[PDB]
Amino acid sequence: INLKVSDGSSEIFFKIKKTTPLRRLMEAFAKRQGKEMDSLRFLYDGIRIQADQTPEDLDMEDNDIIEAHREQIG
């Protein structure tokens, strides 16, 4: 499955399996920004993503977009 992460100032596409936890992507994308995973808030279907969740768990479809917002707390 292919996916994309966008914060508005940058976009990075990712390719991973459906049972791979999204922990890797969120850390990968945040590393590019010079920020650790916690300081960013990731959204799919309007819902905050958690590190142990897989695309199969969230019923993702190929070529979906993931929104990356600056986490304001912490």
Partner: protein
């Protein structure tokens, strides 16, 4: 988990009840108390979120530059068999070099105090790192709840911080709110 329940309890048992009625209470106050809360910035509920769960009961004790002015008119409602259960909120002035630099409705998120007390009382025990994580989870769950409560959520602002002047911390948030207008 614990923080998830406490955040929903904070929303279900407090914010969803008082936020829709807050402007009416502030109007009533301003009209019979000299328009003390002028402008949108001074008409939101500011919720303090110390991520170390240190929640003194007296805000002046936390910062001398935070000083109590008055109370809004009380909200009452029938609640779980209690007639006229009372919800009340306090107005504070923020001082900068002795002068009134700001005026807002200000308070702590009480469940953070609950988390701390649970570390003392709880029999199974509750460690510092667990408490700091649950404090963060409470704040982020509350953020998420409010984002999905578009009907009422722009009546409040969350002020989270780690430890310093609390008054300045608040004033910085207020000045940023005024600039973003």
């Amino acid at each position: 988990n614990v923080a998830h329940g406490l955040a929903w309890s904070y929303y279900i048992g407090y914010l969803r009840l008082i936020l829709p009625e807050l402007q009416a209470r502030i109007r009533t106050y301003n009209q019979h108390y000299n328009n003390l809360l002028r402008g949108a910035v001074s008409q939101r509920l500011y919720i303090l979120l110390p991520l170390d769960c240190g929640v003194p009961d007296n805000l002046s004790m936390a910062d001398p530059n935070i000083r109590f002015l008055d109370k809004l008119p009380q909200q009452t409602g029938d609640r779980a068999g209690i007639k006229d259960r009372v919800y009340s909120n306090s107005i504070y002035e923020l001082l900068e070099n002795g002068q009134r630099a700001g005026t807002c409705v200000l308070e702590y998120a009480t469940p953070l105090q609950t988390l701390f007390a649970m570390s003392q009382y709880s029999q199974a025990g509750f460690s510092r790192e667990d408490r700091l994580e649950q404090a963060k989870l409470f704040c982020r769950t509350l953020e998420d709840i409010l984002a999905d409560a578009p009907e009422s959520q722009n009546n409040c602002r969350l002020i989270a911080y780690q430890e310093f002047s609390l008054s300045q911390e608040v004033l910085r948030h207020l000045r940023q709110e005024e600039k973003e207008e």
